[PDB]
Structures are given as structure tokens and as C-alpha cells.
Amino acid sequence: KVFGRCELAAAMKRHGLDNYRGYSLGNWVCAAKFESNFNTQATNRNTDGSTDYGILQINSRWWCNDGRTPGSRNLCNIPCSALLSSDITASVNCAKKIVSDGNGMNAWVAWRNRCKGTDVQAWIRGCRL
């Protein structure tokens, strides 16, 4: 699904991502913009032999089961392809969890240096929530 600016943000708010682990919604929009450029089908090869799944580019290495990786954890208790689905609830529902270890949104590479130290409200500005 090709997600708009106005479309994905609104949903992450309804998805219960709004200021989750305090992180403002504008981060969540931006990370979705930086990790997949609003693609929910987007999946990428991790060099370590794992794969990136979901709009959140959530890594299959120890989060999910993709049926190709020996040494994978599956904490999410969901198949990887459920991360690629047009309903936002499966990617978001494991993103809370990626933050629920208490290791931060620093599990994402894009929000890591590319989306910090920037205007947070500029994504959301001019769209309604």
C-alpha cells in the first residue's frame, strides 16, 4: 500500500502509537518515511542473512519468522509477512514491542541519526489528528 503523508500518520495515532514511550508521533511518521519511504510491502536483505520486513522495516533476525533464517528468535509470535499487510496494526503492534524492551527507537537505523535533532512537528503540521 502506498501511504500518504496524511494517511499513515493518522493511523499511527489511532494505532496507539501517539507519544508511545513518550516518542512524539512525528518521529513515527518520519521513521516510516525514512525506513520504507511509506512503503508497507517494502522488504530488504540484511547483510547478516536476516530480512527487513514491514513499513517499519522491522528486522526478521530475531523479531519474526520468515522461514529462511537459522538462529531467529520470534518474540513477536507473528509471521514476517504480517508486517507487510495494508492494515497498520501488525507492524505498529510489534513496533511498541521493539520499544517495550526498553532499548528505545534506537533499534531503527533511520530514526537513529537521520531523524533526531530535527523539527519533530513538521511532518504532522498541516494534516489533522
- Cα 46 to chain center, whole Å? 16
Compute, in degrees rounded to 10, the torsion defined by CA atoms 33, 35, 40, 46.
170
Rounded CA-CA distance 47/69 in Å is 12
Q: 101 among the known binding-site residues?
A: yes
8 A C-beta contact, residue 72 and residue 48: no
Q: Is 7 a catalytic residue?
A: no
Name the architecture of domain 1-129. Answer: Orthogonal Bundle (1.10)
Rounded CA-CA distance 69/6 in Å is 36
16: amino acid identity, one letter: G
- Strands, E assignment, 1-129: 44-45, 51-53, 58-59
Backbone angles phi, psi at 52, to 5 degrees: -85, 125
Half-sphere exposure of 82 (CA within 13 A, CB side): 14
Is the alpha carbon torsion for 51, 60, 95, 104 positive or negative?
negative
Q: Is 35 a catalytic residue?
A: yes
Rounded CA-CA distance 126/129 in Å is 10
Task: Identify the active-site residue in 52, 66, 87, 119.
Answer: 52
Resolution in Å, one decimal, please. 2.0
Q: Work out the number of other CB atoms within 10 angstroms of the CB of residue 92.
A: 24
Rounded CA-CA distance 126/110 in Å is 23
> Alpha-carbon Rg of the chain, whole angstroms?
14
Contacts of 118 (CB under 8 A, 6+ apart): 30
Rounded CA-CA distance 110/127 in Å is 23
Task: Identify the active-site residue in 35, 66, 87, 119.
Answer: 35
Reading the block at residue 22, the C-alpha cell is 513518550
